[PDB]
């Protein structure tokens, strides 16, 4: 009577269970001549258990608990379900409302046959019966009474054996992944609810203030623990758990006049992901499942199925949103002045560190530190420049949420920034550990040729003296990365071949003295050798961009 | 820049603005074949508070205190709950994913110098909230726009209202006091009395509850001699012509629901109102004393299709009447006239002598055994 | 007052009292316009929703019927009248308690020449439990020299709890109370801070609550409407003095090792009525008990 195995095996048979003679334990209500009556339940919080000797009570609920949903600790979520229904013209109508049980056996199998069975009830969402009667009239006594437990909805046997590239730069940051969320195995259904023809039925998820419970998985509490993940949550999107506890949800369903309609509600999770991006390789990841407004599914009217190991289905759209936080461990020092053509900032601890600072008028700058040691990174605060402003002066917005830009996190090299900067907003610059030469950081306005870097770091290897080969983290599509050198031999008025190793155009200047000359376009440098004569002792400008990323990294060749 | 002179400035924006980053903070919904998806939200007092932005000569007390002079006082607005409710219905064989998220009323305190706008600080405070939909199948990729708002956005109303900062009809009424009926729906000018405004999309609706979970209510008062036209005063002829018991709480709740047509989206705005009520003192024909009573009521509701901006400057402090016109006329026994009373129906034939009551215009209370002329 | 002085309750389960949530719930049928989704009724999420601690449930357990006081038997002594508190935290914190008393009624002694009514004892033990409802019970250690023990040969103080002789009247509270203070302590202060604090909190939060029944709502509007001080002066020299009551005034929670006591039985359709002592307290006729016999003299 069973295709099983020897050995014991807990099975759920889905909700839609009603229980014998227990039809109109609740009552029932009679409405008339188009009279909508509705009935219903609301609950804030009681199990049924059938043991055998084998299987006692703590057995089947441990067994149960271990894969399908809980019911011991989690009846503290509130449910809530209604019927409606629509008297005819002239006649009267009966409707009667009972619970639906979620049935949970727990079964023993010898030379595949259900030797033992123990069954729990878990309390669902209910049902509905009505009839239209005319005074005097008698109605057939299986409408009221139901002799044997039996199932009205989808008939089910859920059996378990009881025995790419990432061109990101070195900081934390926060992933939206998406909303509807649900558990594997079920684990989140609210219920289903069953509706006869030409009625209409609903199913509401109340939910009580400060009692909603998100879900937290960490990969290393120590640095990534519950608290320092909502507060970069706060810091990357303001996500904060109060205020889901006072929305709500509902979902209704009103059949067709001909077939019954059966609709399946869900809770829901929307799912953060911190992660702590570092040299190419996530060192560090915690997931957060934010409770989220519900899931609704509509179904209609028994092969025994194994249950799915324990993970997340997203219901929702495709959703990836990536936002970089600033690290609360750095300090941040502010320059209250807006920069207009020209600024020397003295850092004050050989520690990086977040410069926060705003120009005061739109233009392509040039920050580098002292003789292009170390190399910076510059970041963008995101949603600054329209809240409070002060003309002439820095008025932070205190916005931790910034938007990389361009720089490299290799303070080893020496380089400098080309980064068009926008008035109306607010900008970061990261100082990565440095010694105690006292370094400062410089920014100058380029009205001049040097505007053709837009947005690119600008790297100065001067070791030419002979193919080398450098290596930088390789930026994002569509962006750029420059390359300063200068051609070996005394200046006097050297086939060099250009390449890349992995990464795929390019441009080529000469540096007048910033007058820089503009020579060769569109080069692609995915191992194309095509070599260039230069004139030995000329500095030359070599600007490439990102068209396919195939590596986390970048090599240039030069011959 | 701005054509204004120089000087500070007070400027409402209007309700509608979205913050950045915050679109799915609250979650979302995702229905399916029919399936009808409704989502609600209750302000009370975490999703209430106001976010201040403010700059050294705009400091917070002083943004606090500017606009709640002029326009709507949010500090005791957010105190009281009100609730709102978006409802979606997912089309036919297909997947419709729909987020809540909040809508603000952006206030600021600007300083103009030489036609250029030189500071500004910026209040935000959470008026209603807004739902965003699409309809998507499994798989398909969703432009980040949709998800993400990288800086503040009005959706409901572009608008700028600015305010410098400055540093003969008959009555035959007999001599008595009388408690007019002014009539019912009067809002204060400056939109001081909006609950809020809800941008309902096509094919979606909208609703604004006051689900009285407080029965607090503010009545106002405004008496031209508080020497006799006391508020307890005119409270106490308030109970004697309409028999008005509870005026400081109320216990009745309003919902105001629209539901936006397939083609165009609507917009609802929700307001508290008042019923006026005149307190007069006639006098040989003229008002000698008059004082007004608006009793907080159950609201107004106003549907308007959802539309360059013009600055423009507030109205002056007054009342607007949206209801219908209404003028009930009651007189009210006139206090500290001591009522005497006889304890017997007159029959056919009866006299009373005025006790000792010197001078002292008093009132005798009588009925008649029969009906009949006297 | 005793019957209104409930113990304050907890907010909601969240922590609060100012406003719970909200539910729509009663959607009207569809129409020509349709989706009526919207058109319904709106409802307090948890109505009541604040948690009583003042209740006694039943032996199933899932009935619950309030209650400020219980009125026991004694305990093991026979003749001991006491009140307990239900928890000692809430009844210290401002929250307020239960008391449950042990009062024995059908025994009396004799003062002088007259007998103590058992009224005001019962009125005593009420009073006593007026600072449990109100969570103004002072620490144990708050006592205050009630008498130099010149029996012993060893210089050593009686000591008395401060509730003992605000409640017990007579002379010896009216040493103690003086028109400035002598004693001052810091429980005074705190009570009145946090019973200040408590009447805020209901006058800002829980009154206005339309989610919340009257039957707790205006019990607490008029357990508030009584000042602290009001609860310190209640004393048993005021009902002595209202009901015309003669009782013990001198150290009288000492009297043990004054003189020894003799107990009289009291059977109640006969020795005591509504006007009380049936003839007087004076000339009432009781039949000493056959306890007398039975008491124990530990020395």
Request: proline share 4%; net charge negative.
């Amino acid at each position: 009577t069973i295709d099983l195995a020897d050995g014991n095996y807990v099975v759920s048979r889905g909700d839609g269970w009603i229980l014998s003679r227990q039809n109109q334990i609740l009552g029932g209500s009679v409405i008339s001549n188009g009279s909508t009556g509705i009935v219903g339940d609301l609950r804030v919080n009681i199990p049924y258990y059938y043991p055998t000797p084998s299987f006692n009570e703590e057995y089947i609920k441990n067994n149960i608990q271990t894969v399908f949903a809980n019911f011991t600790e989690a009846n503290q979520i509130p449910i809530g379900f209604e019927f409606s229904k629509t008297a005819p013209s002239n006649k009267n109508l009966y409707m009667y409302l009972q619970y639906t049980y979620i049935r949970y056996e727990i079964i023993k199998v010898l030379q595949h046959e259900i030797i033992e069975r123990a069954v729990l009830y878990v309390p669902s969402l209910g049902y509905v019966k009505s009839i239209e009667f005319n005074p005097g009239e008698k109605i057939n006594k299986d409408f009221y009474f139901l002799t044997n437990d039996k199932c009205i909805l989808n008939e089910q046997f859920l059996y378990k054996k009881i025995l790419r590239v990432l061109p990101y730069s070195n900081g934390l940051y926060v992933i939206n992944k998406g909303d509807g969320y649900i558990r594997t195995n079920d684990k989140d259904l609210i219920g289903t609810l069953l509706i006869e023809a030409g009625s209409s039925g609903s199913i509401i998820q109340p939910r009580l203030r400060n009692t909603t419970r998100p879900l937290f998985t960490t990969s290393n509490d120590a640095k990534f623990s519950q608290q320092y993940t909502e507060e970069r949550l706060k810091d990357a999107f303001n996500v904060q758990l109060f205020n889901t506890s006072t929305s709500l949800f509902k979902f209704v369903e009103e059949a067709p006049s001909n077939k019954n309609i059966c609709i399946k509600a869900y809770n829901t999770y929307e799912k953060y992901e911190l992660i702590d991006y570092q040299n190419g390789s996530i060192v560090n990841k915690a997931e957060y499942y934010l409770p989220s407004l519900g899931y609704c599914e509509v179904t209609n009217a028994v092969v025994k199925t194994q249950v799915a190991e324990d993970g997340f289905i997203q219901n929702g759209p495709e959703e990836e949103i990536v936002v970089g936080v600033i690290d609360p461990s750095e300090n941040i020092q502010e320059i209250n002045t807006a920069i207009s053509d020209n600024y020397t900032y003295n850092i004050p601890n050989n520690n990086p560190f977040y410069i926060l600072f705003t120009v005061n008028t739109t233009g392509i700058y040039k920050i580098n530190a002292q003789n292009n040691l170390p190399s910076l990174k510059i970041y963008e605060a995101i949603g600054s420049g329209n809240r409070n402003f002060q003309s002439g002066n820095l008025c932070d917005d205190d916005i931790k949420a910034i938007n990389y830009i361009t720089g490299f996190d290799s303070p080893n090299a020496k380089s400098y920034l080309v980064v068009l900067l926008n008035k109306d907003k607010n900008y970061y610059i990261r100082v990565p550990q440095t010694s105690n030469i006292e370094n400062q950081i410089k920014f100058k306005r380029e009205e001049g040729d040097l505007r053709n870097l837009m947005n690119s770091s600008v790297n100065i290897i001067d070791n030419l003296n002979s193919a080398h080969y450098y290596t930088r983290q390789s930026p994002d599509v569509h962006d750029y990365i420059s390359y300063e050198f200068t051609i070996p031999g005394n200046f006097n008025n050297s086939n060099i071949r250009l390449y890349t190793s992995y990464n795929q155009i390019g441009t080529l200047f000469r540096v007048t003295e910033y007058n820089l000359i503009n020579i060769q376009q569109n080069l692609n440098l995915l191992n194309s050798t095509k070599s260039i004569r230069l004139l030995n002792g000329a500095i030359y400008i070599l600007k490439v961009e990102v068209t396919e990323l195939n590596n986390y990294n970048i090599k240039l060749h030069i011959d | 820049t701005i054509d204004l002179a120089d000087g500070n400035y007070v400027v409402s924006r209007g309700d509608g603005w979205i913050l950045s980053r915050q679109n799915q903070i609250l979650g979302g919904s995702v229905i399916s074949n029919g399936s009808t998806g409704i989502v609600g939200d209750l302000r009370v007092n975490d999703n209430a508070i106001p976010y201040y932005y403010p700059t050294p000569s705009f400091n917070e007390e002083y943004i606090k205190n500017n606009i709640q002079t002029v326009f709507a006082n949010f500090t005791e607005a957010n105190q009281i709950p009100i609730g709102f409710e978006f409802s979606k219905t997912a089309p036919s064989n297909k997947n419709l994913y729909m987020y809540l998220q909040y809508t603000y009323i952006r206030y600021e305190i600007i300083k103009v110098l030489q036609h250029e706008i030189i500071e500004r600080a910026v209040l935000y405070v959470p008026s209603l909230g807004y739902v965003k939909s699409i309809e998507f199948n499994p798989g398909e990729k969703i432009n980040k726009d949709f998800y993400f708002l990288t800086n503040d956005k009005c959706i409901l109303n572009e608008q700028f209202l600015y305010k410098k900062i400055l540093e003969q009809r008959v009555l035959p009424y007999s001599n008595g006091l009388y408690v007019i009926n002014k009539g019912d729906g009067y809002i204060r000018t400056n939109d001081k009395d909006l609950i809020g405004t809800l941008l309902i999309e096509a094919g979606s609706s909208g609703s604004i509850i006051q689900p009285r979970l407080r029965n607090t209510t503010r009545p106002l008062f405004t008496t031209s001699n508080d020497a006799k036209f006391s508020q307890q005063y005119t409270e106490e002829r308030l109970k004697d012509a309409f028999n008005v018991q509870l005026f400081n709480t109320s216990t009745s709740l309003f919902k105001f629901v629209e539901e936006a047509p397939s083609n165009k989206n609507i917009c609802i705005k929700a307001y508290n109102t008042y019923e006026k009520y005149e307190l007069i003192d006639y006098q040989n024909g003229s008002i000698v004393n008059k004082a007004e009573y608006y009793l907080p009521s159950l609201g107004y509701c106003e549907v308007t299709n959802a539309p360059e901006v013009v600055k423009t400057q507030v109205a002056e402090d007054g009342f607007i009447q949206n209801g219908p016109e209404e003028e009930i006329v009651v007189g009210v026994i006139d206090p500290s006239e001591n009522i005497q009373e006889i304890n017997t129906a007159i029959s056919d034939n009866y006299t009373y002598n005025i006790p000792g009551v010197n001078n002292n215009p008093f009132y005798i209370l009588f009925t008649v055994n029969t009906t009949g002329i006297y | 007052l005793i019957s209104t002085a409930i113990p304050f309750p907890y907010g909601y389960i969240g922590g609060g009292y100012y406003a719970p949530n909200m539910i729509t719930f009663g959607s009207a049928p569809k129409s020509n316009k349709k989706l009526n989704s919207l058109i319904s009724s709106t409802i307090p999420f948890p109505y009541a929703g604040y948690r009583e601690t003042n209740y006694l449930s039943s032996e199933d357990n899932k009935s619950f019927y309030a209650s400020n006081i219980v009125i026991f038997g004694p305990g093991a002594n026979i003749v001991e009248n006491n009140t307990v508190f239900y928890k000692k935290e809430d009844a210290e914190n401002g929250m307020g308690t239960m008391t449950e008393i042990w009062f024995q009624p059908f025994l009396t002694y004799k003062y002088d020449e007259f007998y103590i009514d058992p009224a005001i004892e019962l009125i005593k033990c009420l009073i006593k439990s007026l600072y449990f409802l109100y969570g103004i019970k002072p620490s144990d250690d708050l006592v205050i020299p009630y008498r130099l023990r010149s029996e012993l040969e060893n210089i050593e103080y009686s000591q008395l709890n401060i509730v003992d002789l605000l409640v017990s009247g007579g002379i010896d509270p009216k040493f103690i109370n003086t028109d400035p203070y002598w004693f001052t302590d810091n429980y005074f202060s705190n009570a009145k801070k946090v019973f200040e604090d408590h009447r805020n909190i209901y006058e800002t939060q829980i009154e206005g609550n339309n989610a919340i029944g009257n039957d707790i709502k205006l019990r607490l509007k008029q357990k508030f409407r009584i000042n602290i001080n009001d609860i310190w002066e209640l004393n048993l020299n005021y009902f002595s003095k209202e009901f015309s009551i003669m009782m013990p005034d001198r150290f009288n929670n000492a009297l043990k090792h004054f003189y020894r006591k003799q107990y009289y039985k009291i059977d109640y359709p006969e020795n005591y009525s509504i006007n009380g002592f049936v003839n007087g307290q004076i000339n009432v006729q009781l039949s000493l008990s056959d306890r007398n016999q039975d008491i124990i003299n530990k020395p």
